[PDB]
Amino acid sequence: GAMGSMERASLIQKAKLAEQAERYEDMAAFMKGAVEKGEELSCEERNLLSVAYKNVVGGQRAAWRVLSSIEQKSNEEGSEEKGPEVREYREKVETELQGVCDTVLGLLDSHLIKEAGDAESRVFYLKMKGDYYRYLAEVATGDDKKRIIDSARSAYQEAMDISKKEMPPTNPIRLGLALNFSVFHYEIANSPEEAISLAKTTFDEAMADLHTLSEDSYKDSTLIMQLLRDNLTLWT
């Protein structure tokens, strides 16, 4: 790999610089190189990995939705034929998105997840695995759509089971996992009632645990709780 000759510490430093420069593709490449050194990632390093690829895939998802909407309009009744171009370019972006998702899943599988034994690392990586299968699910249309969906569900569910046994209900990783699994339920699995139930139960059990927290942990938890509330407000 292109980063094989750079020190692990230098890759991490440059990932932090790229974040400051809003150079997320660079940030992602540096963190991939850091992961490929074979050592486990600290809490900070895991979050740099996640932030980098979330930003990269985020721009691709936003582009794909723009193009998918144009494509759908061009296939409506009374729409003037424009040729293969819209479909071709949507497919190009889609393929790049799928490549990024495959790259992240590849790092999780080789070998981040199998070496992660603490709840805070294992839940984090399994959440990410569910997230990147979910992004694949968003653009899936063929005969593997169901298996992609079930791969996301499976990863989320294992993370939920560990988080419920090993983490307090206000733990921000646990909270962010439940947020994302609830969105999975709502718009990927077509289970809006499960989504609403998960988000309500998650919010209420966090509320009842806030009294145990410091001022700074309180801020971290209530930030994600507000995201659960925002969704519940749209859903009910």
């Binding site: 996640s50 979330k54 895939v57 985020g58 998802r61 909407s69 969704n231």
Partner: peptide, 12 residues
């Protein structure tokens, strides 16, 4: 279309 809240950067 309408995107619901998920964790971390809303970069999309």
């Amino acid at each position: 279309k309408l995107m619901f809240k998920t964790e971390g950067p809303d970069s999309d």
